[PDB]
Structures are given as structure tokens and as C-alpha cells.
Design a protein around this ligand. Structure first.
Ligand SMILES: [Cl-]
Ligand SMILES: [Cl-]
Lengths: 191, 188
């Protein structure tokens, strides 16, 4: 649950991990989805469209993998606005500096997108965020008031759907985590 | 992760919540699956069988709703041994102290206990109720057990924990019913 949180209606937060991608592309623009990754994103779009929900917004990382996952999923959700954000990117001892930076960035995403309620919300909301495993796991554990170690102990599939429900008083329920039940096992990957 | 734990191989723990059942049934023998519940169990059985895994065991609650969910799922898993246990039974929706103690006992007997005989990676199914599944997840991951009620598990859902030999635990999915059509999904 969440301290100092007050929103006007319930929020349904769907956190989608980007699909399988070419980790070894030289430049960020080369780090596109794999053919399997494109099929994963089709399955995720099919699933989301099948829920009978009107989504308010798709917010997505500006990394190539997340833009492409979004391009595919959005075809299934005609009329839903898309917002690109650099805040949901991952940055380029190296390890410690990178973790320090990533910590700040994932907390920033939490505060900006999850803890921050919109004063202009007028009904229950259904919000899609397409991004990466660190920020998704972190948001889940942060929202549920789990320990700082905790997010590293989750492991989420490519194209997976995580559903958090946030009540106006800040009560949080995790309805599903890392759901790829809608994908055949021969399409399921972690990277 | 878990302290005082050394296993020989990795264990894949699949925690399945019983399907939808008749909550108002008078006696425990009347609290059977609803027709939709039988449908949910079939979907969960189909999903489990599709994973290409030879499951080592199916451990289930001795409650009617769990026995019935198991009956259906086991049809999809021929040859897999089944063990009934009262350790996974739930009490009513200060007797609650002993129900609490029993979920800890369950965690200890089934999850924290590794088999010295198991030298190969194992795949273990537990079919039981939302309270003990949520507790197990929190305990295995060293989350505040009071976190338990922040987790919501659909009927017939699959929750998957991975336990490495050194006791490191990963949560791979929680409350997965993505294999069920939306109109078949229930929480009670
Ligand atoms: Cl991303
Ligand atoms: Cl049960």
C-alpha cells in the first residue's frame, strides 16, 4: 500500500515487459524485436484487447524494443493514446554506478507514474505501461511495501502482463504478476 | 530466499489455487466445485500438461474443493503421484491462531524442506487455497508476511516459485490465469 496517496478513483495498472529483442545490436536502433519477440507482442496485444476494457493511455519507454512492442500492441487497441517517455529507459565500478543511476531512475518512474495520482482523473482508469523488467519489478514491490531487496527476487517473461489495482486510499492489490499464460510454452522467453 | 537451506537440485514449485466452489455448502462434502470451477480446473490441467514437464508429485489439500480440482488436473498428468494432506486445509473464512500456525507448518514441511534424495531438478505441484499460497510466496521470498492480503489469486491460478540449491528463490509468475478466457475467470 502507499503512504501519502490520494486519488479520485481506482487505477488498474497493466505493466507489460517488452518482447524478446536483439541484445547484441550495435546501436540502440539495432536493438529491435526478434521474430519471436514480434509474435510475443501480438499475443500480448490479443490478450489485452480481449479483456473488454477501455484503456486510457499507453505510456512506453523510448527504447527501440519498447517502441516496437508498443507499435504491435497498439494495433490491437485502436484509439488509445500513446506517450513515449525517456524516464522508462535503461541507462548505457561500472556495475555500482549503473545500479546507483538505475535506482534513482526506477524510483523516479514510481513517483512520477504510480504514486502520482492525476487530479483530473474522473473515473476508474486502465493504464498500460510498456517497459523493462527492472522498473516493473521495482514498481510492484514499491507499491506493495516490500523490502528494498525484494524486486530482484522477481523474474518476468518477455511480453508478460502484470496487473496492479490501486484504490483511492492507497490500498494496492497485485492481481497477476508476469502473466504469459496466454502464450504457448514454445513462445515464452525471459530474454 | 531461505536461510538454513541446501538442496541438491533446483525445485520448481507450482502453487495452484483450487477452482471456484460452492462456498455456501453446508458440510465440507457439499463444498464441491461449481460447473465453472470444473471448467477452470480443466484449463489449468491443459496448461500444466502443455509445459513439457514430468511433475514429481501433486500435493493437495484434503478439502473437497482441492480434491476435486486435483481429480481433474491429474487426468492431464498420468503417472504423477498424488499426496493428500491436512496440513494444507483451511479453517473458517482465537482458532485463527492455530490456522496461522498450520500455514507456517505447511511452509516448513513442503517448501523449506528439501529432499536429500532429489539429485535432479524437480517440478512440484501443490493444489490448495489462496491463504496458504500467499503466505508461502511471502515467506519464501522474505517479504513481510502481512503482505499476504495484498496478493490476489484467481481460482485455478498458477503461481510459480523457483528454489535454487543455495536457497535463493525467484518468483516467475503469480496468479496466472492468462490461459483462461476472460469470461471464465473468477476470484470466488
Ligand atoms: Cl524498455
Ligand atoms: Cl484447499
Amino acid at each position: 500500500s502507499m503512504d501519502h496517496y490520494k486519488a479520485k478513483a481506482t487505477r488498474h495498472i497493466f505493466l507489460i515487459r517488452h518482447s524478446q529483442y536483439h541484445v547484441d545490436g550495435s546501436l540502440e536502433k539495432d536493438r529491435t524485436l526478434t521474430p519471436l519477440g514480434r509474435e510475443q507482442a501480438e499475443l500480448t496485444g490479443l490478450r489485452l484487447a480481449s479483456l473488454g476494457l477501455k484503456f486510457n493511455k499507453i505510456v512506453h519507454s523510448s527504447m527501440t524494443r519498447a517502441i516496437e512492442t508498443t507499435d504491435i500492441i497498439s494495433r490491437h487497441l485502436p484509439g488509445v493514446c500513446k506517450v513515449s517517455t525517456d524516464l522508462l529507459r535503461e541507462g548505457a565500478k561500472p556495475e555500482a554506478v549503473q545500479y546507483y543511476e538505475d535506482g534513482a531512475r526506477i524510483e523516479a518512474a514510481f513517483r512520477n507514474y504510480i504514486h502520482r495520482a492525476d487530479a483530473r482523473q474522473e473515473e476508474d482508469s486502465y493504464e498500460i505501461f510498456i517497459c523493462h523488467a527492472n522498473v516493473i519489478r521495482y514498481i510492484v514491490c514499491r507499491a506493495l511495501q516490500f523490502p528494498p531487496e525484494g524486486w530482484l527476487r522477481l523474474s518476468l517473461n518477455n511480453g508478460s502482463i502484470t496487473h496492479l489495482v490501486i484504490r483511492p486510499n492507497g490500498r494496492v492489490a497485485l492481481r497477476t504478476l508476469g502473466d504469459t499464460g496466454f502464450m504457448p510454452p514454445d513462445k515464452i522467453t525471459r530474454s
